[PDB]
Design a protein around this ligand. Structure first.
Ligand code: HEM
Ligand code: HEM
Ligand SMILES: O=C(CCCCCn1ccnc1)N[C@@H](Cc1ccccc1)C(=O)O
Ligand SMILES: O=C(CCCCCn1ccnc1)N[C@@H](Cc1ccccc1)C(=O)O
Ligand SMILES: C=Cc1ccccc1
Ligand SMILES: C=Cc1ccccc1
Ligand SMILES: C=Cc1ccccc1
Ligand SMILES: C=Cc1ccccc1
Lengths: 449, 449
């Protein structure tokens, strides 16, 4: 009944606890001490952090709780607008865009995106085959090059050409800088931040201008197998209305934000766990070698990379790269039979803690064991939520998994990998998670493309 | 590409008389020793191929290319098991329905609720052995069948077969074992030479089985947390429908068939290998004593019997008590790059031969070494298949291992064992395998319950 709460800082309450450069990891350690639920207070804010499957299975009841915009999502809303990620469920553009865009994200739609994903994956492989001896790979940097180009090409037929660059593209310099200012507002109205505010607005213009220009450019009349084409021609069956031009821009910005970082973190964590668990890497490499029998993987071959998928899911279990989502109570209700909640009360789902629920997973929760995911139907309901929940779950889940399976499968086919530094896991936190400074050496197996 | 070997033939009867033997699996293993990883086996009206190498079976386990087939054995068991989970085709609507409804009651989390009833039966077996007089011996498979049959009755539908109060088995299982015996006999009949007595007996055997079950279902409908309760109150999330009363009785018969025989064979082979390998017995007894520190084991203590679990996995490697399953090709495909298969072509997986693949386990394949299973990541994919494959794998796997671990643990804690007759392994073959005539002496350690 009485809810635990971590240490306070006077009038700032719990907020200075987030004034740290690893806040998710700080929140995990608080859950380790306090258990399945703790109250987290800030000036003007009250929420509760959930960590057990028993409580989260209830928070996930869509009849009782809806998606809430966390403070992080409200700041991203300043440039993602009413895109799909940062809109409320009752907002008319959510359901409209949801109905128009769901078909472009089905497993059936990945048959059309596959060729462009292979385009960028081949560039990654060729980059690595062209390294000189004893040169190394900066893994998260190269996975980010791959994911951003993949979504740019598949989403709106745009080539960021990240593998031709050292300093990232100007659009993503401002975009990453906007996301960086959003996270900083969390752990902060002084005049010293006025520079950041003026810089934030100029970053929004850089983003809107490039995107709004592409929308105007295409509207040429050309038709391509990309999200942008479906967004100019699609009509919501419900209202019979197409998305208006402002909403298309928000979706494009949204897909770029939601696209690259979460997926590049997954690939980066997957490769870290492979080089730290050589038996698992051997099993994944044997699968890649025997399934990917052509110089260019096909869509069907990728679907046969079952163990590669298990590696991906277990990497998502330990470090889900979009590590929380937020909910509010639609009506007065009782949580777990012990925590009465009022209408509008907020919950945070701490995904990495959920995924360490010993009562669900047994006691070896910290060990990387893809064999946990041999039979996916066996996993209890709402114990594994890397892609969120319900109708507000990740619309790009199939896209992200198909890209990551394809790319990891090709990496494992084409190179042997060496953890030549004995890399010490160091998780850098933005709004997403990635293993900072992770480096490897790749020895080519000299298989042609 | 490669011409497939085939064992000796008998004119128009082809290979079928090779199965007219009282140890057909063992005969099939010796054929595999002579012919290798794959051989064609022909019968009047039937063609199948027996696989014995991990290299071919890892492709056969690809669910996009092969689905579960009903062997001739399972087609005959279907005459009284109906469309229960074990003898239904994957495309049958009652398979997926019953599968979705019954998975939560077979989860590792559900074993916490069965545990008390499992201990109930384990204590009965322990007390039987401590009440033996000096120089009396234990009939091991007989007592393990008493235990597993009572555990599935109690945990499954709150019915007490009271096997430890009986000399002659329960009337329901008299026909149940006699129906299984007729099913196996139909396999090895070179027929219709006035077999009507067997036919008339088969029908009366079915009637005994349905009547007892149909009454238990009728009795209950006029709450106990058992499989029967979940089956009356469970609704499939997909179709939203519950199981009908006909299918419920097929499931009950199926669990009684599939429950006890395979699991009692496992405990029996496990104890045989333990008394034939005294260092392994000692090591498992030492684990039992330091883990089982209470007079009654808890669910958590059973999960800590790690070496006992490896002992069970190693007995399952040498003598998997459900020794084959059947698959069919969903589409034309090539097996191993050298054996073209047409859509609908059948495969048999000879599990005990698979588990003797020297390229997987080394050259000492015949030695009992539980340490092979310290890390599941070290085992190549699909090398170890005692519970079948994929979505048609054994649903009762966690039930069987928890029961067998609890019971073996209590056995090792409470008694020292003597292989007083220097027992010579003699494997009796039904549809399952057991060590016939296996007897031991147990000297009590005098630790109270
Ligand atoms: C290119 C890949 C991806 C795209 C295009 C994408 C896009 C999106 C979009 C549009 C939403 C909002 C959906 C809605 O509310 O209607 C969303 C939600 C979400 N996504 Fe993704 N996503 C991608 C990859 C990923 C990855 C790899 C992960 C995690 C490992 C992830 C985790 C999530 C989560 C947890 C949510 C729910 C957030 C919340 O409830 O507030 N996404 N995604
Ligand atoms: C109380 C214990 C057990 C129960 C309740 C049980 C039940 C079942 C059921 C219902 C199925 C069919 C699943 C489906 O197709 O949806 C099945 C399959 C299977 N079981 Fe079990 N079982 C038990 C113990 C065992 C043991 C101890 C073994 C072997 C050591 C075993 C080996 C197998 C195999 C090999 C299959 C797949 C058969 C095939 O593919 O044709 N089971 N079991
Ligand atoms: O916990 C989090 C982390 C969630 C980040 C997820 C953003 N994402 C998801 C998918 N792609 C991006 N955010 C809280 C922190 C906070 C709590 C109380 C008071 C102020 C801030 C919030 O924003 O409310
Ligand atoms: O190989 C086997 C042994 C497998 C029995 C499995 C029994 N079990 C499995 C799970 N629970 C019970 N059975 C073949 C024999 C046969 C082959 C060719 C032609 C005729 C007969 C079959 O009947 O299909
Ligand atoms: C007597 C042992 C035996 C071994 C293999 C096949 C049939 C019988
Ligand atoms: C939806 C059909 C189906 C296919 C395979 C397994 C279970 C159900
Ligand atoms: C050995 C099987 C058995 C089962 C119940 C009672 C007596 C014997
Ligand atoms: C340690 C024994 C072993 C077990 C399985 C695969 C390789 C080695």
């Amino acid at each position: 009944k009485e809810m635990p709460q971590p240490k306070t800082f006077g009038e700032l309450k719990n907020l200075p606890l987030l004034n740290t450069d690893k806040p998710v990891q700080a929140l995990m350690k608080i859950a380790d001490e306090l258990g399945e639920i703790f109250k987290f207070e800030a000036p003007g804010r009250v929420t509760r952090y959930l960590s057990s499957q028993r409580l989260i299975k209830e928070a996930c009841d869509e009849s009782r709780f809806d998606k809430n915009l966390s403070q992080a999502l409200k700041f991203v809303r300043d440039f993602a607008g009413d895109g799909l990620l940062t809109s409320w469920t009752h907002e008319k553009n959510w359901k409209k865009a949801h109905n128009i865009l769901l078909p472009s994200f089905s497993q059936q739609a990945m048959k059309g995106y596959h060729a462009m994903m292979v385009d960028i994956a081949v560039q990654l492989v060729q980059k690595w085959e062209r390294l000189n001896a004893d040169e190394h790979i900066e893994v998260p940097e190269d996975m980010t090059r791959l994911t951003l180009d993949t979504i740019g090409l598949c989403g709106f037929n745009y080539r960021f050409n990240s593998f031709y660059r050292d300093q990232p593209h100007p659009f993503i310099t401002s975009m990453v800088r906007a996301l960086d200012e959003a996270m900083n507002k969390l752990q902060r109205d002084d005049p010293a931040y006025d520079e950041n505010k003026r810089q934030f607005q100029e970053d929004i213009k850089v983003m809107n201008d490039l995107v709004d220009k592409i929308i105007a450019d295409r509207k040429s009349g050309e038709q391509s197998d990309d999200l942008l084409t479906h967004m100019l021609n699609g009509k919501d069956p419900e209202t019979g209305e197409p998305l208006d031009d402002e909403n298309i821009r928000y979706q494009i910005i949204t897909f770029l934000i939601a696209g690259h970082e979460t997926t590049s973190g997954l690939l980066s964590f997957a490769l870290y766990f492979l080089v730290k668990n050589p038996h698992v890497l051997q099993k994944a490499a044997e699968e890649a070698a025997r399934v990917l029998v052509d110089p260019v993987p096909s869509y069907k071959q990728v679907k046969q990379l079952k163990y590669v998928g298990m590696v991906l899911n277990e990497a998502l279990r330990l470090w889900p790269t979009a590590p929380a989502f937020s909910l509010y109570a639609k009506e007065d209700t009782v949580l777990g039979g012990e925590y009465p909640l009022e209408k509008g009360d907020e919950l945070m789902v701490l995904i990495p803690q959920l995924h360490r629920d010993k009562t669900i997973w047994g006691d070896d929760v910290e060990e990387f064991r893809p064999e946990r995911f041999e039979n996916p139907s066996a996993i209890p309901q709402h114990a594994f939520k890397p892609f969120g929940n319900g109708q507000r779950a990740c619309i790009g889940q199939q896209f992200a998994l198909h890209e990551a399976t394809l790319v990891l499968g090709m990496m494992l086919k084409h190179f042997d990998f060496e953890d030549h530094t004995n890399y010490e896991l160091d998780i850098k936190e933005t709004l997403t998670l990635k293993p900072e400074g992770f480096v490897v050496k790749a020895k080519s197996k000299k298989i042609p493309l």
